[PDB]
Design a protein around this ligand. Structure first.
Ligand SMILES: [Cl-]
Ligand SMILES: [Cl-]
Lengths: 6, 6
């Protein structure tokens, strides 16, 4: 799983 | 921005 927030 | 992959 992969999650990114900016 | 938000991105999620599973
Ligand atoms: Cl992934
Ligand atoms: Cl953040």
């Amino acid at each position: 799983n992969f999650l990114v927030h900016s």
